[PDB]
Design a protein around this ligand. Structure first.
Ligand SMILES: [Mg+2]
Lengths: 494, 87, 1269, 197
């Protein structure tokens, strides 16, 4: 009874089922603030029941607890009137399991919403590892004033901007937000076939850029010159004329003036660095407001751009058949050389692997180039890939070029993993054949099995690490030590 | 047979989580019912001195030995029938 | 063409595809080879149950005075049909009775008369026509298992230091494992039932190989030379292959018994592997040995040197030395005599009692070892052992190959028939033991083969199998596809299989032998990945239990397109198999210079001359679910897996609609699911209504003469029936009065079907674009039109059952008058305290009111007086009513009460009168049936002469040679026992008479079952488990519309949660003003690589603009050019790239977006079932902590990781409240509730109760735990 | 993540090309420590220097400040193209070696002999079915006392040197064959870097 996961210690002493708790599916609230959450009316009414009872007795409506409970269960308008004010200043801890790091529990100030699903801020998703494909979250209600103060000053999501692992921001825009910001801050150059309105115009401030953009006289991606404040070589803010885009000006209307002027196309890496810099110069509240504003801007302009996924964006290179035929001819020549007796079996196998790898690399590069120069860099798939919103070179190559060479389904007893000589010449727009799909299912299932079976090891490692590091707490201020460690740059391959 | 008709709670996984449960509302309601019964009995005890002395002692004896018409009748002098009628 | 059917535009180009095997064959045909109700006596010789009857008979007592034999068995029609069994909660079973003959073999007791009798063996669960077992009112599936095939398995294991150890394991059909192994010392060894080790040569001697001459001649490694001076001098230097021993007899006299025992003692004069020298010649000569053995000069003997090493580790030298050593090693005691000493080995390895290989095992061992031992030997032999050791030695020299554990020829399928046969064998063995013991104890002549038999010992095993075995699983009853997948599942888990913890990666991967037999896509995504597989659409299981898939033979490059052959994993090895889509000339020759072949795990490119076989269909590798994903070739395998998993969780909808883009297998799934009413023959319907469909079947004149039933037949449609998962089965007629029908035609739609096609979702207009962040991270933005038009609305039925039993304190009653509840809460209850049909079950209402007799203690005088004066206000009854949880909102659709009739004296006399009247009525029916049968028979055989009719007792009821007239036709005592003989000289007349008698027997058995059921309901009443008086069931229907939080999914692995229900005017709309119905995130498409959903999006739109539905078979579907042609014909932009307008502003979006029609499903993960909130509620009585579960109104778990996060934040206060005052500080939580209500300060927390439980457990372990200040 | 990154790959083998050449990344003077070299013959028939020491360390040091800019280790059997004290520039190929299989370099000229090397006991011959190419791969022997040894002797038969051959190594020489200094005797097949684990 005392031993194991189900034992007394690990089931009833180190972790307990708790009161004033709830659980429900999570939907996305994009119009909320970083420190807000949407609680369904029934969930809030059940969680905050003693507080509603206190207000009901104080108001003189009832004098006993049972009558107040009956009134609450009848779902009267007075209950909601009380609960609206009861909610204020009383945050709730949202938790998504597994709780790998401390950001898995975060305090949110709740608001009453319709429906039965918790509304969660999108920027918190990365902290929770939470998507909206069926995920569920748990709500815990602090009771004492010290617990509420801890929630408001240590757990509030607007305070959990930085990752404790490395110090870099964790509340960074992702997916639609990054795609919209990238679309707004990317430059477009005027050509005779497609003119860009308002190119080369000089503006006295961001005010005139806003006026011209609102009157539809300068395009969002037009290259303009604007007089704004920027650092000089000495670090002082001085007015200067910068060549930028309209979208960059609009993005900088919400960037704090202490961070200077940002004149770069916004991807995930640049956004992370920019949020870190703004937090370095300003404080947390300013960074939170900046995050909310740029979230709204990115969502708005991704929505306005109509960015889709069409088969026209998956431009299969016209040269694919030529490269495949040339590689087939090379493989035929290598096969002849092995047949009549110049190269060994291993040499022929290695040469075939080499030629197919080179052909796959060239095809991937050509698909990269085509998708990059399509629509002057405004291909939606390319914007998703280059902004960091979603995608990679491998997936796009599987969509446009070829799936490449696949590892053989050899057992662990067999030494090493060979590569099938015939690669998957087809991609997912053309359509894999029966044999190619059967080949791919082995790798897919191996990856899924690794995912589903090799997180118990991660949990065990985390448990052992926590138990060996539990007692390490900053207890004093100075250990009066003359000892230390030498730190130098970390160089790999010089 | 009775001991072999009894299963083991270990046959249900995590039986301590979702089984063997109770609600304190039932306990509070039971104690409230007990208090109501006690108040009724106190009301009856307060009414008792207002009755005739013989009928008060009949009830007092009937509350410390208990509707024992025979032993009360020999104690009193009245018969079983008379004592029952007076009670 | 069938009436009311959709004619799809089919894009397949592959011809001559063989018809699918019946999708439920793996269940129906397996159970039909073990059981049936309508088999004739002559056909009952190869039916499986007969074999399990012979394997347990005869049963003879130890005194051999009595012998009991089995003759035949009979199966009676079920007492209750499937629908009634599902309504009451009983097991759909057939009663089995057997014919037994008990006789005496000892002539001394001549007063015992031989008896032939029928004995009720008991009720056996019976398989429904849909392939399921109705147990206790719930449908279950016996899942086919994948285990290790019987035979010989050769394997390797890497030892700790790195030296290989080889093994040869014999896997029997039933019994323990016989394992030979190689030790790190190079010594061969054998294991007996996983006990301690044993030298192989010791076993070889125990078999009967007395001397080392036989042992060395087994492998032919020694040369025999006669002992002589010149001969020994000629062979000087050679190593001795055998020990040179001196044989003499020593007389040992036992003091206890006085018998002189001559023990043959052998002294090792010369050891093995000793180089012969001149000195050893004199020793050999003095030993008086006749011949000696020397090592052969052949080099190959070195490869056999391990045997010699084993000989060096054998401490035995004679035939009986090894036997005695084996006895001492096994029974842990000295042998009593040599007879039992030999018998222990002869019974451990050569006896069928401890283990049997079976036909499959014998065949596999014969094929593997290259022997031809007769198939009648189910146990090992000495030749088998010799060949196994030979194969192990050949393996050790790196001259053979290791067997593959994951090969599909080495994985065998235990079907439902095999599992039921094994359980029946266990039960009948127990029954036979009981019969034998009963015959042992009985010496009185008054004992017959009925008193010998216990039905309980068989019913117990069968019910245990159907109730507690891992393979008797709750059926997935969400939609027809879920049933058809669960019935075709192959599980590697359960008894005799692997475990999740023990499951390595290798078994979970996809083997090259899974091609066409196991689906490489449809597997669970989690801890059960790879361990639970799905049968492929063309896969069968042969008689031996191995998966077989069909192919087309290719002889000299010419494909035989008219015939196909089912091949197993082993029959395919060494052959090159091509595809099905290979272009072919007019003569059948392959028209490709280079063809990619599938030879074992490799994919070579060879000429058509080298091709041996070809696939038969494009979708041979996929399961039913995978063969329902259009454009599967355009999806990643992971997304195909997820889509196959999600299509099985799609709830049936109130108004289902078949997809515009479908593969074309939906009709086959609907037909083979057998949930819809399939017409059994050609006919014209008579009358159609929401509850029934009656149709006149066309029957031939001969069939009408033989059949006792009217051509008309009525089918009752299933109306709002609860599944195992809560979903509803609602079937509606799609046939009008007057239409014509054919065999297999569906007369009804519903249960996620539409017009005979599977319909799991609805067609929705879709635009792929970001929408204000409301479709962020796999979220779904849907239009309010979906809620307005009831598109995604479903019905979910819940069943609430209350038992009222006989308790010691009194019989609990069902009444609407229950104490201390207002008159409003008992307004909707009837006399029996049961909610009315049509009421609204708001949370907290009483469904089935109940009163339980309260606990009157001793009636103290004070209580007596208080009741005497105040009254019986507190009457002895406590509320035991069923109350709805604060999440149940529904409408009562049906209520049922099942009761046992009260046994009274007047009721007993009334029951006797009623049973007499019913008996008279049933003899009237009997006589009417007999008269009809006699009239039909006289019509059949009028004017002919009888050739002899023999009954079951051998008496000729109808004398031969007499003409046929009415008089003796009505003089026949009974027809149900007329077995044997020929009625007439005409074969056709004889066949007609046999069929007529078979149908007469069927009808008579059915009417007898009806009479028995009427007797049971008059006497016992409603069937109900003992100890419970009444059962009250209330069925509540929940209309669940689509709401925010509900889960939706497509067929391509795309799933989401409805994040916002958006008004019509706020939706993106086209130039014509029509808004889209769903907005999906385009970002989900590239990374997840499920491009197929885009293709289906475009094609579907064309369909919606052309009134067309499409068939797009997987790997033989629509190319982009066909979609382009259809979109150009429908006035739809290519690739669905359209300019959209914002509904809230009106501005056209900057870029064009992908717009079309997508098939969207609604999964069974609804926010109604997921939301739960608790402030305070029930706690545990042990841990004093909140319970767990929405049904228990429990609280969420703040586990170890949450505590770690709280500690990392530094929240001492929040962690303290979570640990003490919110969970188990009994006083603290009440004081905190009071303080929150009254506004006061929070109480000081105290010691948690779980800590006190821990302390009490520690004290119960004898530890003095002291808390000190 | 160390177990979830495999899911996105989908089982496709990565194009991990092992660096077969080590080059100079900075301008300076190369100093080699613990360097032993022999004169061998490459595939082209010309003379080359082959390193026979496993502890060679090459340091590229700036000629102006004297601070060691870079440090690298010279693999055994690699072909050395830069001598000690020679000035080098950026991009110069310092050395090249076989990444797939390591090599054993003979340090003396003489005859090659086998010790405890027998067919079917310590090594096996793999023969191509089509071309008939034969490769002698050393396997694990049951008798641990039989250690496959290569003996390099002089013309008088005295064993100058003995080399231990590990399990799995391919024999590139024959018994009784005459060899020169710097010739590769036994090619040990290094475990090829598969798709990123
Ligand atoms: Mg999720």
């Amino acid at each position: 009874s005392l031993k194991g996961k189900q034992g007394r210690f690990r089931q009833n002493l180190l972790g307990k089922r708790v009161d004033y708790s709830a659980r429900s599916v999570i939907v996305v609230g994009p119009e909320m603030k970083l420190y807000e959450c949407g609680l369904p009316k029934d969930m809030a009414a059940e969680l905050y029941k003693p507080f509603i009872i206190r207000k009901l007795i104080e108001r003189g409506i009832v004098k006993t607890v049972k009558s107040a409970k009956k009134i609450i269960d009848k779902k009267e308008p007075v209950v909601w009137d009380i609960l609206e004010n009861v909610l204020k200043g009383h945050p709730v801890l949202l938790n998504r399991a597994p709780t790998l790091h401390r950001l898995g529990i975060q305090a949110f100030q709740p608001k009453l919403i319709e429906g039965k699903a918790i509304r969660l801020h999108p920027l918190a998703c990365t902290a929770f590892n939470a998507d909206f494909d069926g995920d569920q979250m748990a709500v815990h209600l602090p009771l004492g004033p010290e617990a509420i103060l801890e929630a408001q000053l240590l757990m509030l999501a607007s305070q959990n901007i930085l990752n404790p692992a490395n110090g870099s921001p964790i509340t960074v825009p992702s997916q639609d937000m990054v795609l919209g910001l990238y679309y707004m801050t990317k430059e477009k150059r005027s050509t005779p076939e497609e003119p860009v309105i308002g190119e080369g115009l000089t503006f006295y401030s961001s005010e005139e850029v806003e006026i011209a953009f609102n009157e539809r006289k300068v395009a969002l991606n037009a290259i303009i010159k604007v007089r704004t404040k920027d650092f000089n070589e000495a670090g002082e803010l001085v007015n200067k004329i910068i060549e930028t885009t309209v979208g960059r000006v609009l993005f900088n209307t919400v960037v704090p003036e202490q961070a200077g002027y940002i004149n770069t196309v916004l991807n995930k890496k640049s956004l992370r660095n920019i949020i870190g810099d703004i937090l370095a110069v300003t404080d947390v509240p300013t960074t939170a407001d900046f995050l909310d504003k740029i979230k709204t801007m990115g969502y708005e302009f991704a929505f306005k751009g109509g960015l889709s996924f069409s088969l026209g964006d998956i431009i299969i290179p016209k040269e694919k058949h030529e490269m495949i035929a040339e590689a087939n001819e090379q493989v035929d020549g290598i096969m002849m050389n092995y047949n009549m007796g110049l190269i060994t079996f291993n040499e022929r196998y290695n040469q075939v692997i080499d030629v197919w790898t080179s052909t796959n690399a060239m095809l991937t590069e050509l698909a990269m180039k085509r998708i990059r120069e399509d629509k002057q860099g405004f291909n939606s798939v390319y914007m998703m890939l280059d902004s960091g919103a979603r995608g990679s070179k491998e997936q796009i190559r599987q969509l446009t070029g070829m799936r490449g060479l696949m590892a053989k389904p050899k057992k662990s007893t067999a030494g090493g993993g060979e590569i099938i000589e015939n690669p998957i010449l087809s991609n997912f727009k053309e359509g894999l054949s029966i044999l190619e799909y059967f080949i791919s299912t082995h790798g897919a299932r191996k990856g899924l099995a690794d995912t589903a079976l090799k997180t118990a090891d991660a949990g065990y490692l985390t448990r052992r690490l926590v138990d060996v590091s539990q007692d390490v707490i900053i207890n004093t201020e100075d250990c009066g030590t003359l000892r230390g460690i030498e730190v130098e740059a970390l160089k790999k391959n010089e | 047979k009775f001991h072999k008709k009894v299963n083991s709670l270990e046959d249900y996984d995590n039986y301590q989580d979702y089984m063997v449960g109770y609600d304190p509302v039932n306990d509070s309601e039971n104690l409230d019912e007990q208090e109501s019964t006690q108040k009724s009995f106190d009301h009856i005890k307060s009414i008792l001195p207002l009755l005739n002395a013989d009928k008060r002692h009949l009830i007092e004896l009937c509350l410390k030995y208990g509707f024992q018409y025979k032993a009360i009748s020999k104690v009193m002098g009245k018969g079983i029938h008379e004592t029952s009628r007076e009670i | 063409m069938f009436t009311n059917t959709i004619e799809r535009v089919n894009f397949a180009s592959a011809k001559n595809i063989p018809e699918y095997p019946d999708f439920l064959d793996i269940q129906i045909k397996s159970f039909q080879d073990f059981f049936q109700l309508e088999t004739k006596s002559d056909e009952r010789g190869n039916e499986g149950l007969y074999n399990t009857f012979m394997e347990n008979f005869p049963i003879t007592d130890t005194r051999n005075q009595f012998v009991l034999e089995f003759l035949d068995y009979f199966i009676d029609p079920p007492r209750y049909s499937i629908q009634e069994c599902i309504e009451r909660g009983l097991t759909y079973s057939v009663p089995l009775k057997a014919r037994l003959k008990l006789y005496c073999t000892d002539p001394e007791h001549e007063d015992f008369e031989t008896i032939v009798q029928d004995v009720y063996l008991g009720t056996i669960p019976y398989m429904t026509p849909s392939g399921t077992f109705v147990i206790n009112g719930a449908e279950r599936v016996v899942v086919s298992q994948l285990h290790r095939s019987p035979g010989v398995f050769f394997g390797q294991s890497f030892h700790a230091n790195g030296t290989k150890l080889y093994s040869a394991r014999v896997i029997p059909f039933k019994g323990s494992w016989i394992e030979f192994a190689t030790d790190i010392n190079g010594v061969m060894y054998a294991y007996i039932d996983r006990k301690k080790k044993l030298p192989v040569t010791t076993l070889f001697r125990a078999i009967g190989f007395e001397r080392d001459k036989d042992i060395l001649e087994i492998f032919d490694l020694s040369e025999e030379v006669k002992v002589s001076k010149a001969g020994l001098k000629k062979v000087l230097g050679r190593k001795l292959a055998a020990r040179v021993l001196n044989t003499w007899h020593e007389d040992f006299v036992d003091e206890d018994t006085g018998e002189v025992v001559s023990i043959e003692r052998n002294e090792i004069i010369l050891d093995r592997d000793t180089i012969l020298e001149k000195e050893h010649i004199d020793e050999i000569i003095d030993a008086d040995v006749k011949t000696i053995l020397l090592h052969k000069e052949n080099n190959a003997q070195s490869d056999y040197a391990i045997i010699h090493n084993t000989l060096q580790k054998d401490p035995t030298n004679s035939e009986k030395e090894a036997v005695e050593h084996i006895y001492r090693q096994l029974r842990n005691a000295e042998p009593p005599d040599e007879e039992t000493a030999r018998g222990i080995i002869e019974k451990l390895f050569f006896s069928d009692q401890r283990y049997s290989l079976g036909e499959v095992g014998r065949y596999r061992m014969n094929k593997k070892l290259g022997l031809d031992i007769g198939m009648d030997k189910e146990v090992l032999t000495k030749e088998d052992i010799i060949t196994i050791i030979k194969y192990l030695i050949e393996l050790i020299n790196s001259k053979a190959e290791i067997d593959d554990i994951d090969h599909l020829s080495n994985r065998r399928v235990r079907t439902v028939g095999e599992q039921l046969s094994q359980q029946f064998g266990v039960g009948l063995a127990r029954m036979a033991r009981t019969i034998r013991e009963r015959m042992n104890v009985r010496d009185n002549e008054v004992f017959t083969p009925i008193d010998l038999i216990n039905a309980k010992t068989l019913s117990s095993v069968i019910n245990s199998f159907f109730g507690t075995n891992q393979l008797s699983q709750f059926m997935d009853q969400t939609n027809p596809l879920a049933e058809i997948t669960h019935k075709r599942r192959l599980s590697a888990l359960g008894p005799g299989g692997l475990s999740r913890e023990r499951a390595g990666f290798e078994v979970r991967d996809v083997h090259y032998t899974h091609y066409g037999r196991l689906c490489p896509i449809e597997t669970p995504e989690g801890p059960n990945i790879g361990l639970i597989s799905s049968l492929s659409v063309f896969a069968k299981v042969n008689s031996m239990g191995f998966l077989e898939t069909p192919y087309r033979k290719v002889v000299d490059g010419k494909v035989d397109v008219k015939e196909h052959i089912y091949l197993s994993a082993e029959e395919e090895e060494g052959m090159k198999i091509a595809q099905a889509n290979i272009p072919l000339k007019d003569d059948g020759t392959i028209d490709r210079e280079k063809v990619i072949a599938r030879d074992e795990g490799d994919f070579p490119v060879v000429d058509p001359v080298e091709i041996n076989y070809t696939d038969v269909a494009p979708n041979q590798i996929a399961s039913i679910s995978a063969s329902l994903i259009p454009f599967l070739e355009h999806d990643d395998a992971n997304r195909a897996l997820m889509g196959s998993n999600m299509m099985r969780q799609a709830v049936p909808l109130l108004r289902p609609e078949s997809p515009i883009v479908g593969t074309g297998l939906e009709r086959q799934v609907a037909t083979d699911s057998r949930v819809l009413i399939n017409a059994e023959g050609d006919g014209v319907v008579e009358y159609v209504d929401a509850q029934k469909i009656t149709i006149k079947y066309d029957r031939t004149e001969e069939e009408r003469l033989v059949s006792f039933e009217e051509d008309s037949k009525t089918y009752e449609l299933v109306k709002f029936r609860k599944t195992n998962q809560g979903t509803s089965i609602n079937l509606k007629p799609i046939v009008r009065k007057g239409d014509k029908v054919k065999k297999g035609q569906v007369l009804c739609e519903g249960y996620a079907t539409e017009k005979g096609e599977l319909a799991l979702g609805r067609n929705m207009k879709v635009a792929f674009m970001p929408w204000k962040g409301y479709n962020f991270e796999d979220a779904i933005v849907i239009s309010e039109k979906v809620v307005r038009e009831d598109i995604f609305t479903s019905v979910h039925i819940d069943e609430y059952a209350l038992e009222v039993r006989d308790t010691k304190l009194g019989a609990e009653e069902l009444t609407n008058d229950i104490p201390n509840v207002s008159e409003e809460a008992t307004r909707d209850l009837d006399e029996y305290g049961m909610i009315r049909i049509g009421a609204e079950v708001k949370p907290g209402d009483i469904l089935i009111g109940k009163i339980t007799p309260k606990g009157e203690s001793d009636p103290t005088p004070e209580e007596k007086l208080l009741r005497a004066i105040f009254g019986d206000k507190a009457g002895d009854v406590k509320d035991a009513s069923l109350k709805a949880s604060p999440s149940l909102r529904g409408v009562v659709i049906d209520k049922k009460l099942f009761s046992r009739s009260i046994k009274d004296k007047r009721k007993r006399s009334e029951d006797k009168e009623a049973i007499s009247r019913l008996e008279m009525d049933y003899e009237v029916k009997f006589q009417q049936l007999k008269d009809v049968l006699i009239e039909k028979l006289f019509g059949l055989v009028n004017g002919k002469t009888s050739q002899g009719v023999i009954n079951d007792l051998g008496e000729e009821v109808l004398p031969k040679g007499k003409k046929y007239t009415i008089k003796m036709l009505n003089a026949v005592d009974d027809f149900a026992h007329l077995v044997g003989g020929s009625w007439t000289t005409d074969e056709d007349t004889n066949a007609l008479v046999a069929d007529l008698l078979h149908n007469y027997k069927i009808k008579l058995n059915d009417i007898q079952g009806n009479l028995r059921r009427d007797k049971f309901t008059i006497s016992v009443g409603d069937e109900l488990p003992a100890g419970i008086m009444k059962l009250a069931k209330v069925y509540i229907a929940k209309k669940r519309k689509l709401k925010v939080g509900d889960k939706m999914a497509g067929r391509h692995g795309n799933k989401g949660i409805v994040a916002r229900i958006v008004r019509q005017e706020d939706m993106p709309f086209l130039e014509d003003g029509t808004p889209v119905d769903i907005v999906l995130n385009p970002l989900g498409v590239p990374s997840r690589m499920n491009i197929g959903q885009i293709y289906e999006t475009v094609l579907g739109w064309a369909g919606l603009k052309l009134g067309q539905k499409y068939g797009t078979p997987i790997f033989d579907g629509a190319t982009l050019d066909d979609i382009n042609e259809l979109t150009d014909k429908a006035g739809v932009p290519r690739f669905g790239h359209t300019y959209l307008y914002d509904g809230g502003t009106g501005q056209r979006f900057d870029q064009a977006a992908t717009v079309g029609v997508i098939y969207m499903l609604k999964l069974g993960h609804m926010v109604d079932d997921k939301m739960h909130a608790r402030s305070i509620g029930p706690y545990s009585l042990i841990t004093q902590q909140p319970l767990g579960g929405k049904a228990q109104f429990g609280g969420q778990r703040f586990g170890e990781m949450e505590v770690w996060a709280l500690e990392a934040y530094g929240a001492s206060a929040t962690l303290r409240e979570i640990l003490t005052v919110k969970s188990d500080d009994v006083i603290g939580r009440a004081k905190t509730y009071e303080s929150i209500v009254k506004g006061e300060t929070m109480p000081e927390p105290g010691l948690p109760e779980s800590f006190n439980v821990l302390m009490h457990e520690l004290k119960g372990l004898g530890l003095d735990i002291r808390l000190e200040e | 993540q160390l177990t979830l990154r495999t899911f996105h790959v989908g089982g496709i083998a990565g194009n991990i090309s092992e660096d077969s050449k080590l080059e100079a990344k900075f301008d300076g003077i190369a100093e080699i420590e613990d360097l032993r070299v022999v004169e061998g013959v490459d595939n082209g028939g010309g003379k080359s220097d082959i390193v026979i020491s496993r502890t060679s360390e090459i340091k590229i040091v700036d000629a102006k400040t004297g601070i060691t800019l870079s440090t690298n280790n010279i693999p055994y059997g690699s072909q050395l193209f830069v001598k000690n004290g020679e000035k080098i520039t950026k991009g110069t190929v310092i050395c090249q070696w076989d990444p797939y299989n390591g090599v054993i370099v003979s340090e003396f000229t003489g005859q090659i002999a086998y010790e405890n090397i027998e067919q079917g006991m310590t090594y096996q011959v793999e023969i191509d079915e089509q071309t008939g190419f034969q490769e002698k791969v050393i396997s694990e022997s049951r008798n641990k006392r039989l250690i496959p040894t290569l003996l390099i002797k002089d013309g008088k038969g005295e064993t100058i040197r003995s080399y231990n051959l590990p399990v799995g190594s391919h024999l590139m020489v024959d018994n009784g064959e005459k060899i020169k200094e710097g010739k590769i005797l036994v090619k040990i097949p290094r475990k090829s870097a598969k798709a990123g684990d």
